[PDB]
Each structure stands twice: as C-alpha cells, then as structure tokens.
Amino acid sequence: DPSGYNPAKNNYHPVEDACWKPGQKVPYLAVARTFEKIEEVSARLRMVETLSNLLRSVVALSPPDLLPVLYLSLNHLGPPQQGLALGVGDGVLLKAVAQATGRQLESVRAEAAEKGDVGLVAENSRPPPLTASGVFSKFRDIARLTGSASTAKKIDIIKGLFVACRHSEARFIARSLSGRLRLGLAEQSVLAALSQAVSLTPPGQEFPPAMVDAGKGKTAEARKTWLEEQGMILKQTFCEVPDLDRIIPVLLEHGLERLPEHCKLSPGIPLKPMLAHPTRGISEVLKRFEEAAFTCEYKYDGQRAQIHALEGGEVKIFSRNQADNTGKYPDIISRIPKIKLPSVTSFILDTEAVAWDREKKQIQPFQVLTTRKRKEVDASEIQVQVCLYAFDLIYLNGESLVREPLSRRRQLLRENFVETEGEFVFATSLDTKDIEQIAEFLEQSVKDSCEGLMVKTLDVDATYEIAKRSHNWLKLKKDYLDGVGDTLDLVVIGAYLGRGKRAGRYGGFLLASYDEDSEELQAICKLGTGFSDEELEEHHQSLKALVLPSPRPYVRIDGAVIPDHWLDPSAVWEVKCADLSLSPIYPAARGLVDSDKGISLRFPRFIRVREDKQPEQATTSAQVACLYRKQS
DNA sequence: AATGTCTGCCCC
DNA sequence: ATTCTGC
DNA sequence: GCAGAATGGGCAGACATT
Ligand SMILES: *OP(=O)(O)OC[C@H]1O[C@@H](n2cnc3c(N)ncnc32)[C@H](O)[C@@H]1O
C-alpha cells in the first residue's frame, strides 16, 4: 500500500520497497510521501537520497512516468522556453478549496493566512487513486485553458483533484498549484537526485533489472567521487540544455555517460546565464580576485536578452529565465544583419536590452522599458526603442565558447560584431587593477544612467561554465556600500501574516513616510527582507501591543494591500533602497512630482531599528520628493 | 466598451 | 530583485 | 559558499465584472 511507502528507508530496494508494481502507473501518493520524507529533514544530502530512491523505482518500474515525476518535484510544467503557466493564484485556488469542502471562501482565506500554508487547509477540510502522470497531465490541462469562462473550468479540475486525494496528496497538490512547494529541495537537488538514480539504477534493463545498485561494488570513497563525476556530467549538460524534454529520452535510451554526445549547446535552445554575486566595496573585489586580472563594465538597467542566431538565419531571443521573448523584440530581429559581419553564420550573444530615447540619444529608466508590449508585437507599433548593450559571446559559427576564457570571448565579440550608436554597442569597459580609477569608474557609471559596475576576471576562472560556478561575476552597486546608498526612516503602520518559513508571525510590513503638510502618514512600500530570523521575532514581540482593530484616520494607504494587522504608528525603521520610482498605488508624496502618482522604493530592505526617532521625525514626504528628483 | 482584479518557471 | 540560514 | 526560500515595486495581458 502506497501509504506505508518509505523512500527514506535504509537499504532501500527500488523494486521490493517500491509501493507499486512493475509497468503500473506511478501513484501520486508515492510522490507525496517522498515529499513528506524530504520535508522531514534539512540536510540536502539526506533529501537527495530520499528523492533518489523514488526516481530509481520509477526508472526500474515505470520509465515513462520519470519525466512527469521530475517536473512534479521541480514544480514546473515543462521547458521554460515553451511558457506553460498555470494561471492559478491564491484566489482561484482558495475558491477551489472552498467549493470542494462547501466551506465559506472567507473562512478558508482566513485559515490560509493564519497557518501560512494553503495545503494544510486543503487536506484537513476534505474515485480512482491519483497517479503522478495523471496529476501532472491535469496540471497541464489547467495551464492550457484560455478565453472567457476559463477560470471556471480551472476550478472544476482542481476540485476533481481534491475529491480524489488521499492522506497527504491534497497538501502537495495545493502547494504545487500556488507555486510554493517549499520542500527544501529544488533544481540543483533534483538534478543531483537524478544523476544518483540513473547511476545506481541504470535505465534500459530487461525486467527484472539485474543491476539494482551499481555502487555496492565500490568503496564508500569511490562511490562518492563517482557520483560527483556523474553529477557534473548531468549539470554541465543541463546548464547548456536546461530542457528535460530533450535529456530524459536521451538518458533513458543512451545512459548518462553518452549524454554530452546527444544533448549539446546550440543556438535555438536557451542556456543557463552567468549570474553575479554582490560585492560590498572595491577592496572586497581585489580580495576575491586576489591576483587575477579583471575588467569593469557598466551595469545597464534593463532586461537581459540572450540572442540566438541559428544556421540559415532564424533568430530567437530568450530572457534571463529561458523565457521566449522573440516576439517581443521584432525591431531587434530586423537589425541582426546590421550587427554581425557577413562571415558570421551563427552565434549566441549575452546583451542587456535598454530603453533608448532616439530624440535625446540617452538611456531611459528601466520603468520606460517595462511599458513595451510583450506578445505578438508589430515593428511599426513600437514606441519604446531598445538599444542592445552586448557584453559576452557564448557561441560563434558553430563553435561553443563556454569553456573559453573571457579575454578570447570578448575579443571575438568585438572583432565579429559592428557597433551602431543607439542600437547595438559593446558595454563600456575598463581593464585595470588600479584601485583609484575603479572608484572613479563606478562614480562615472552612475552618472551615465547605470546601476553600477560588473567586475569579471579575464583569464583566471573566467569561463562560462555555470555548472562549475553559477555566480562567477561580481556586481558592484552604489547601494551596496555601507554609507553611500540612500537610507530612509519609515514608520511601521501595518503587518502581513507570513507564509512558509514566516508562518505564525509577520513576514512583511507596511511602511509610511510623514507628510508634514497634511500631518498624515503616507504608505510608501512594504518590507519583507533585511532582518534576521531573530530580528524578525523581536519585531513580532514589540509590534504585538501596537495592534489595532481599525486603522487610524491620519494613515492613508490608498491602493496598497490592506495589512492583516493594523499597527499603531510607533516604530521607526531605517530602510535602504537602490532607487525611487513613481507608484501607481502608493500615496507617499503624491502631487509633489506627478499629479496622480506617488513614490515608492525599489528593492527596500530593513537595516536597523531607529529607537531615537518618533513618527513625526521620520523622513518627510517632501524629502522623498527631493530624492526622486536627485536621480535626474 | 469601459472598468476592476488578479497573475506571472514576469521583469527587475 | 535583496537578504538571511543550515549545511 | 552553495541552495533554498522568505520577501520587494511595477508593468502588460488576461480575464471578470459592470
Ligand atoms: O542584480 P543582478 O544580479 O540581477 O544583476 C545581474 C544582471 O545585470 C544585467 N547586466 C547589465 N549589464 C551587464 C554587464 N555588462 N554584464 C553582465 N550583466 C549585466 C544582466 O541582465 C544580469 O542579469
């Protein structure tokens, strides 16, 4: 019986200890108890093994269900470049839970907020038993629905799933739909669990499988080294081809060793991009890079654009998360011939799409870029022009450059691509170890309409192998410096019940500034990050007394989300941000810059408490206005 | 045909 | 995006 | 330091409601 399933079992046998029979379809309950055993622990190595045992049983018993069970545990619908989206939020879900249990929607919504988890409500308030491949297909059916009355058809499905739920199945069905699985295990741990499963239990064995455990013959050391090697093979390929629809069929048929022979990097298929770690100062840069030469580049404030040009001429563009944006930039696609030399037959560029004002010939804020149409755009309709700032070249004329140094990669980019003012230009750079010019260059970057600087090594560990290290670059933003960014003292006026980790306490707060004209507290932004788990408990201590049943007449929030608990304006907090913006919902400083829009904070985070200030002495709305203008 | 609300492997 | 935390 | 999971503002689409 799948209820007694225990994948965290010792001496787990993929066949004997499995809770379904060969060929049969993987029960969803077996995928839930696995989630139970993984949620039950915190050492990732323990989670990976438990999930590895489940995958092994799938490979030996129900090969076809391997791909569904993977996505189910990743909580994804498929390759990110396809775009399948549930379209279900807490609203559609909560309504689905209410109708499935006849309860009142408001009663359900309350318990969900209180307990900080939708799945715990869905199961306590509760047909063939659900199957993994079936529960996944339904999830796909949900995301495919469109048009009028589609929201109704979605709830019907979600209800049918909760009606057939058993034991803990409902808990994770609900959490999957809301997008907050939170097992303590995600992409990197799933890939590790997969490489471990296909190595210990190879696929493609005549049943019954002769080789159930391939590591038994090895020593404990040889087994660990062998799993790390096999692990890297998988993760390196995935970073080039993050597409399980392509890998699993190759894996089940040709095994993991042959994988880099069938699934290889190539234009048209998006790849994991190189990310960046934050640095706190110019000194820290030279401390992490030690003696290796590096370069500094502007950090343009736009949207990453991974441009692919396949053999023949087809052009695709992908976002930072492998999302397909080709249809969004029909103007870029028309200028590809203008940026590549006639000898270039294919390539993969790493650029930053930035809003460009062709009248003034200057970069426009990230906000202007956000007003571009996103789907099926006609080139003539375009209103916000975009300028591409190229900073890397990952593929050129059939050759991959992942395993090449940045010096060569940047040299090939500059020699095989043509610059054009206000369309395609190479990122402003500066090769220097001099500690003085860097500080000058960072200051100069902000003056040129950028966030700050990107720092990258040129030869020493300067490859593009996300598998070996995903955060190889360094981002140096002015607001990272402890004493340079813009800090504000804001008033805590409301609290939001937290979810997951924050369940049972405040996970976010509503902050306000002081408008000395009307003598009212104006909400300016919410706050959710910056405080430790300890600091966040003390905030639940000091704020419990200031709780109110009704808001105060001199607190104006307008379109901001109503806090679950109103608070008596008393506590003042220091808050830091990267910039200020015009807000469509916040009332803070409304009328001082824009007629209809107030001012909010981009990337606010808690710093420390300001016991030395009272609400009246908090940052005034007039001050907020002066700050916004200071950005020019 | 406006207006209002929710959603997003959204973008940052 | 920023930030924190167990490993 | 990796991996994971808390949380932010704000936009265009999509869909519900009037
Ligand atoms: O803050 P963050 O880690 O998301 O920053 C990384 C993003 O910064 C963008 N960007 C802008 N300019 C560059 C250069 N010159 N090099 C690398 N990245 C750059 C990217 O869109 C990246 O996702």
Tell me how crowded residue A563 is: count the other CB atoms within 10 A of its CB.
21
Helix H segments across A75-181?
90-100, 105-115, 118-124, 132-144, 150-163, 169-177
Strand C nucleotides with an atom less than 7 Å from a protein beta carbon: 1-7
Instruction: Tell me the C-alpha distance between A379 and A48, whole Å.
Output: 48
CB A88 within 8 A of CB A177: yes
Check whether residue A83 and residue A160 sit in a common domain: yes
Report CA(A298)–C1'(B2) in Å, whole number: 44
Torsion, Cα of A341, A347, A352, A354 (10° steps): 50
Q: What are phi and psi of A507, to 5 degrees?
A: -105, -20
Return the H-helix or E-strand segment holding A593: none
**CB under 8 Å, gap of 24 or more: what pairs does A110-117 form?**
A113/A497, A113/A564, A114/A497, A115/A503, A115/A504, A116/A497, A116/A498, A116/A499, A116/A500, A116/A502, A116/A503, A116/A504, A116/A507, A117/A175, A117/A499, A117/A500, A117/A503
Resolution (A): 2.8
| A480: CB within 7 A of chain B nucleic strand | no
Check whether residue A253 and residue A167 sit in a common domain: yes
Check whether residue A204 and residue A344 sit in a common domain: no
Q: Whose CA is nearest to atom 13 of ligand 1?
A: A299
Check whether residue A360 and residue A242 sit in a common domain: no
Closest CA to the C1' of D11: that residue is A370
Tell me how many domains chain A contains. Answer: 4
Q: Does the annotation mark A299 as catalytic? A: yes
Closest CA to the C1' of D4: that residue is A184
Check whether residue A519 and residue A461 sit in a common domain: no
Check whether residue A475 and residue A576 sit in a common domain: no
Helix axes A220-240, A187-200, angle to 10 degrees: 120
Report CA(A597)–C1'(B1) in Å, whole number: 26
Closest alpha carbon to A185 in A37, A377, A312, A358: A37
Among A380, A402, A427, residue at a domain's last position: A427
Give me the half-sphere count of Cα atoms (radius 13 Å) on the Cβ side of residue A479.
17
Check whether residue A82 and residue A162 sit in a common domain: yes
Tell me how crowded residue A48 is: count the other CB atoms within 10 A of its CB.
24
**Residue A85 carries which side chain, given as an amino acid letter?**
A
3-state SS, A108-126, equals HHHHHHHHCCHHHHHHHCC
Ligand 1, CB cutoff 6 Å, lining residues? A 275-276, 297-300, 304, 320, 352, 391, 427, 454, 475
CA A451 to ligand 1 center in whole angstroms: 9
Instruction: Tell me the C-alpha distance between A179 and A91, whole Å.
Output: 13
Q: Is A352 annotated as a binding residue?
A: yes
Q: Name residue A316's beta-bridge partners.
A: A308
Among A37, A154, A235, A299, which one carries the catalytic annotation? A299
Check whether residue A122 and residue A154 sit in a common domain: yes
Residue A375 DSSP symbol: S
Check whether residue A269 and residue A318 sit in a common domain: no
Cα–chain-centroid distance for residue A465? 19
Residue to mutate, A271, A279, A299, A306, ligand 1, most ligand atoms under 8 Å from C-beta:
A299
Q: Is A478 annotated as a binding residue?
A: no
Tokens (6 digits) for A415: 């020699």
Cα–chain-centroid distance for residue A399? 30
CA A6 to ligand 1 center in whole angstroms: 44
Q: What are phi and psi of A572, to 5 degrees?
A: -115, 135
Please provide the distance, in angstroms rounded to a whole number, between the alpha carbons at the two ends of chain A: 67
Residues spanned by the domain of A364: 302-427
Check whether residue A269 and residue A123 sit in a common domain: yes
Check whether residue A17 and residue A40 sit in a common domain: yes
Q: Is A616 annotated as a binding residue?
A: no
* Nucleotide whose C1' lies closest to the alpha carbon of residue A603: D8
Task: Note the maximum CA span of chain A.
Answer: 81
Strand D nucleotides with an atom less than 7 Å from a protein beta carbon: 1-16
Check whether residue A392 and residue A474 sit in a common domain: no
- The experimental method is X-ray
